[PDB]
Symmetry: C4
Subunit: 76 residues, 4 copies
């Protein structure tokens, strides 16, 4: 290799595989998040809601308690 | 260290730990996304759907409203 | 380009697009995770819980079994 | 700055903020994935399963159809 390309390669090898791992993991969870939305769709088509209440209208107390618990977990 | 390796190490230390954190977080959410799919599986085996309607057939109005709300949130 | 900027650009081109992909994927799953929380909110407002039991009080056996299964999957 | 530190800083500024964004997004979805698991826990404690069937025992047809749909989406 040229001197400069040898330097570039030495820099990159310190984290090339780390970025590869992150990319692959992000693809897995992207895929899982898509599957999760399909399952909500099928479940809610089979068990429809009379009204769909989103958090900008009213936040369920259960959602609020879960958010507070996790917020405190992350602080701890 | 050699001069070149001292440079490589100085470059890498600016973000080594940032990549480590990202990798570890991506592993956590990868794990959680897998657990989430297992829970859907157990729930739906215990409470099966007569028909499974995916979004390429029909999108539940509840899913559509949630997607629009979040799309507007991200725009804001 | 200057010599130094040519070096900087050669280094960066080894992973610029990899970081772009990761950023875009993380935005997608961030968006999906927000939609997922809205759907829980709407579902639980339509089907409320008499009590909301979080994992720091009691972990459902179903959640515990899913966590053990996925933990063993990742080990394998 | 020294010459070498000026080079290090020029390299890093090409993607410092990109990594910061990824780190922050991964923290958001990590948090949301934790909230999601708490909501499953509360829901399943209020609506328990007589048996918890995980995918290594039997995969629900609904889960299988969602996985195939998303697999084909990603291929397209």
């Amino acid at each position: 290799l040229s001197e400069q390309d040898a330097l570039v390669e030495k820099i990159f090898q310190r984290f090339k595989k780390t970025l590869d791992v992150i990319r692959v993991r992000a693809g897995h969870t992207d895929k899982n998040a898509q599957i999760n939305l399909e399952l909500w769709n099928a479940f809610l088509m089979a068990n429809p809601l009379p009204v769909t209440v989103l958090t900008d209208q009213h936040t369920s107390e259960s959602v609020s308690m879960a958010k507070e618990k996790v917020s405190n977990d992350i602080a701890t």
